[PDB]
Amino acid sequence: VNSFSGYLKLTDNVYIKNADIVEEAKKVKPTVVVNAANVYLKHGGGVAGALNKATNNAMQVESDDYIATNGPLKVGGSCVLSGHNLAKHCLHVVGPNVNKGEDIQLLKSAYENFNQHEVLLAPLLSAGIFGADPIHSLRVCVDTVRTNVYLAVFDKNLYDKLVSSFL
Numbered sequence: 001v002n003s004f005s006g007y008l009k010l011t012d013n014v015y016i017k018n019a020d021i022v023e024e025a026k027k028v029k030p031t032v033v034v035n036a037a038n039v040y041l042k043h044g045g046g047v048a049g050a051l052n053k054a055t056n057n058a059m060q061v062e063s064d065d066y067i068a069t070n071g072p073l074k075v076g077g078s079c080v081l082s083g084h085n086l087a088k089h090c091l092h093v094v095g096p097n098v099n100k101g102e103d104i105q106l107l108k109s110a111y112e113n114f115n116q117h118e119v120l121l122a123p124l125l126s127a128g129i130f131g132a133d134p135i136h137s138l139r140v141c142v143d144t145v146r147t148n149v150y151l152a153v154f155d156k157n158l159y160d161k162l163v164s165s166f167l
């Protein structure tokens, strides 16, 4: 049994809710919240900007030190950093950004990072300002992630379309 409330069950392991991921993280304090990260961990917009704002920029400060030591992530890669006031840990995952011309096949690689964590609160990778089709992102999620994932979708309209169209 876990804390997550109000989710629709899509599969054995994937759940979905119309929710503001910062507000959900603040309520649940999950072990892992996933950030929609980029290679230089610059949390300025989309999910990264909202999560970082909710940490009063502490996520960005920590991330800048991580990059100064380790260099950029790979597209499709991830790192584990603090969850600050939102979660125990933040899994920063880099989905491909279609608005930069990145290969959408890297979306499956991105989702594979979730399998290293038994339970996660996450957004749909590569959705929003990353430019991918969220319907496609949900399909890759269901077909790739085997651990228990609780998806928060910001737009009510999009949430209803994702559920109605789910095979």
Ligand SMILES: O=C(O)c1cncc(-c2ccccc2)c1
Pocket (backbone or CB within 6 Å): 020, 021, 022, 046, 047, 050, 123, 124, 127, 128, 129, 152, 153, 154, 155
């Ligand atoms: O649900 C998403 O895929 C999503 C994409 N871009 C931004 C957001 C967002 C926007 C404001 C607050 C918290 C999350 C969610």
